[PDB]
A paper describes a structure:
The anti-parallel dimerization is mediated by α3-α3′, α3-α4 loop-α1′, and α1-α3′-α4′ loop interactions, forming an extensive interface of approximately 1400 Å2. The anti-parallel dimerization of RiSTING results in the sealing of half-site of the ligand-binding pocket of one protomer via interaction with the α3-α4 loop of the other protomer, preventing ligand access to binding pocket. In the absence of a ligand, the conserved arginine residues R233 and R235 of anti-parallel RiSTING moved away from the ligand-binding pocket, accompanied by the extension of the β-strand, further hindering the recognition of CDNs. The SWAXS results demonstrates that the major form of ligand-free RiSTING in solution is anti-parallel dimeric conformation, but the subtle inconsistence between experimental and calculated curves could attribute to the existence of small populations of alternative conformation of RiSTING, which is speculated to be ligand-free V-shaped dimer as previously reported Capnocytophaga granulosa [name] (CgSTING).
A recent groundbreaking study discovered the ancient origins of the cGAS-[name] pathway in bacteria, which play a similar role in the immune system to combat bacteriophage infections. In this study, we demonstrated two distinct mechanisms underlying the regulation of bacterial STINGs and a structural basis for cAA recognition and oligomerization.
Author numbering:
A (entry chain A): 158 to 315
B (entry chain B): 159 to 315
The structure:
């Protein structure tokens, strides 16, 4: 499974763009004009799908606010869509990486059936893919110096 | 060239479907019509199924959900599938949801190509499609289900 490549795709086309907006703009502005100088990114790696009725975050996501962030990238204007949540005077860009949704589907809907008695072994392999994804995401953030803008959190560590 | 995700999908979806087809002598429609020559068409998409510019964005809602019951190692079990009856043939049709993360990368992330690496990333991700197909075919042949199943990469059709 291409976990490191999926982490690079996700970082370079979502996470870094978001960081570049936060840095260039001095935070994310709410629609009323309120700028949040304390704008950070929270990346949560879920176990089950967020839409699963037995998921921790099945309701949280409805509280998010969609924003279109504009930023400059190598001198050219670009934009990206993020989901935000304000807490304690701080703005959080929150994302469950959809590039992992295939494994989330395996965890919610296929592994619990365990027809061939191998689900424990399979599930260990898939969780190691989540570990390599998180590892690569942190290394890329550190490479670019965005490690204080980004927290990556595995659901198992909640 | 093996995929664990393919093995999970095969063992918990494809093989259950095949065991119903074999045990039932085909899949029955709601009117009771039994389609003896019931087959499975597994389509490996490039874009998401919901993507507005995907071949199969429209096809999907023409399908009818069916609960297949079957016996597995002495216990009664079931699996839910989506069927299409066309020209006297019943096809179980599935876009493996275990591949949706790669479909999301291909539809929603790679076209932005911020760092001009999308072409290389896309070659690497397509490797996962090839390994998925290889694994499904190998497991289907192992179990003698290879004539029940057709695995189609979008790149080939």
């Amino acid at each position: 499974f291409p976990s490191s490549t999926l982490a690079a795709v996700y970082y370079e086309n979502f996470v870094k763009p978001t960081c570049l907006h936060i840095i260039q703009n001095g935070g994310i502005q709410d629609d009323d004009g309120t700028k949040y100088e304390n704008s950070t990114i929270k990346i949560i790696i879920p176990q089950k799908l967020t839409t699963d009725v037995n998921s921790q975050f099945q309701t949280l996501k409805k509280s998010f606010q969609t924003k279109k962030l504009t930023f400059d990238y190598l001198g050219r204007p670009r934009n990206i869509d993020v989901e935000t949540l304000i807490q304690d005077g701080k703005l959080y860009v929150i994302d469950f990486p959809t590039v992992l949704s295939g494994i989330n589907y395996a965890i919610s809907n296929l592994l619990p059936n365990d027809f061939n008695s191998m689900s424990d072994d399979y599930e260990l392999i898939l969780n190691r893919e989540f570990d390599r994804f998180i590892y690569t995401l942190n290394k890329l953030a550190l490479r670019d110096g965005y490690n204080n803008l980004i927290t990556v959190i595995n659901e198992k560590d909640i």
